[PDB]
Amino acid sequence: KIELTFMFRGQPQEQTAYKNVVKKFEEKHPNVKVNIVVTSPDQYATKLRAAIAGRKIPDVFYFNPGELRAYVNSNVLLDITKYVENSKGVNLQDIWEKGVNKYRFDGEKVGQGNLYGLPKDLGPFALGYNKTMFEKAGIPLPDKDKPYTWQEFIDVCKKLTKDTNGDGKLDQWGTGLNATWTLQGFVWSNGADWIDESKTKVTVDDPKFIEALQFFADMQNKYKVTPSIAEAQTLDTYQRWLRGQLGFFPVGPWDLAAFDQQIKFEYDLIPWPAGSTGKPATWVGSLGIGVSSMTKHPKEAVELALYLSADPEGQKALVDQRVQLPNSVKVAEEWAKDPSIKPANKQEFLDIINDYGHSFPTEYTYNGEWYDEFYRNLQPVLDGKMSAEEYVKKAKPKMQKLLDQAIEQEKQASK
Ligand SMILES: OC[C@@H]1O[C@@H](OC[C@@H]2O[C@@H](OC[C@@H]3O[C@@H](OC[C@@H]4O[C@@H](OC[C@@H]5O[C@@H](OC[C@@H]6O[C@@H](O)[C@H](O)[C@H]6O)[C@H](O)[C@H]5O)[C@H](O)[C@H]4O)[C@H](O)[C@H]3O)[C@H](O)[C@H]2O)[C@H](O)[C@H]1O
Ligand SMILES: [Ca+2]
Known part of the structure; x- marks a missing residue:
């Protein structure tokens, strides 16, 4: 009742x-x-x-x-x-x-x-790769523990980007990462963040942040290891990963049922490629x-x-x-060790939780509006119409005003 x-x-x-x-x-x-x-x-x-x-x-x-x-x-x-x-x-x-x-x-x-x-x-957000695609291409498999450098990652992504059916058109690509969910790891592994240690100052204008954001956009526009802007509009890169068109794409545990249903190729998990710190990074949701x-x-x-x-x-x-x-930690540990449950390296999820996963920056702030503003106007950078450097200089004061307001509104609401 x-x-x-x-x-x-x-x-x-x-x-x-x-x-x-x-x-x-x-x-x-x-x-x-x-x-x-x-x-x-x-x-x-x-x-x-x-x-x-x-x-x-x-x-x-x-x-x-x-x-x-x-x-x-x-x-x-x-x-x-x-x-x-x-x-x-x-x-x-x-x-x-x-x-x-x-x-x-x-x-x-x-x-x-x-x-x-x-x-x-x-919710540790791991990196997956298409093992079927690697083995068809004759490319040595990624290491399950040692991250690619950024240059190594681009190199392999370029090798995977090709015309596989011989009609003259690229139909397979290295990757196609969504900045909303995958930019963080590149920023963090390059020794940068959206905000400072105290979580009160916006730091997207850090040269290390700019380098990470420019590298990210360059995957599509410069290194050309992704579907084109028009191709991603036609069919988004998550769907292209499901259909076996992409070498790398992220994997969260919430994806597993969908992937069980739709993915026909073999895939496994690896650490994210690492920037200047040499340590991989990603988020734990x-x-x-x-x-x-x-x-x-x-x-x-x-x-x-x-x-x-x-x-x-x-x-x-x-x-x-x-x-x-x-x-349950103990249940998760025995889960990860059970080889009958795929991906083979689902231990990577636990390694993210225990070692190299970070929180979203908004988990530290009273609200997330300052962070949403960064992403709201990001697309021209991603499509190569504006440099990372120009954008973060323009975004920073808008973000900072919103963050200052979050900090104040905390003080007022907590009385
Ligand atoms: O920007 C370009 C866009 O691409 C095109 O749209 C395609 C997109 O692809 C499809 O999305 C695929 C999914 O996206 C990634 O997953 C990200 C999100 O995770 C899922 O939620 C799981 C949930 O979140 C975790 O917590 C994370 C955060 O932590 C806290 O701080 C905060 O509270 C949480 O938000 C939890 O641990 C966990 O339970 C969401 O479902 C998903 O959005 C994976 O790659 C795929 O699962 C989808 O069709 C499009 O969005 C467009 O052209 C363009 O917009
Ligand atoms: Ca083709």
């Missing part, structure tokens, strides 16, 4: 997986009915923001770790600490500490104190599962969040359905 609203986002394979697992929850808890509100990833932020603006908050919902402090200040998230402590069996200490701590807040800083959510997952401060059924709502995040039965179902890696 109890009814909960569960609001979340996902690609089609993720929507199916979580709907299936919510049904398992309902089977286990016959007195609870869960009403689903689900959107595409791109639609989610707008829809959640509207719910919160109207103070019509779903009982259980996904949220961005960068919004944690703002959600606490505006009393959006229930303090679920005591419900989790009283729960039968589940020990959050089995779960990735990096994941759990993103949703703790002690009143002053993130990473400690009361629980205001549970981790949906950790996460989403939180939160409970509305205003929920009429806090026990049942926390029980649902726990089922998805930490319950061994719920987690097993999500992992079996190939939309994430295990939240």
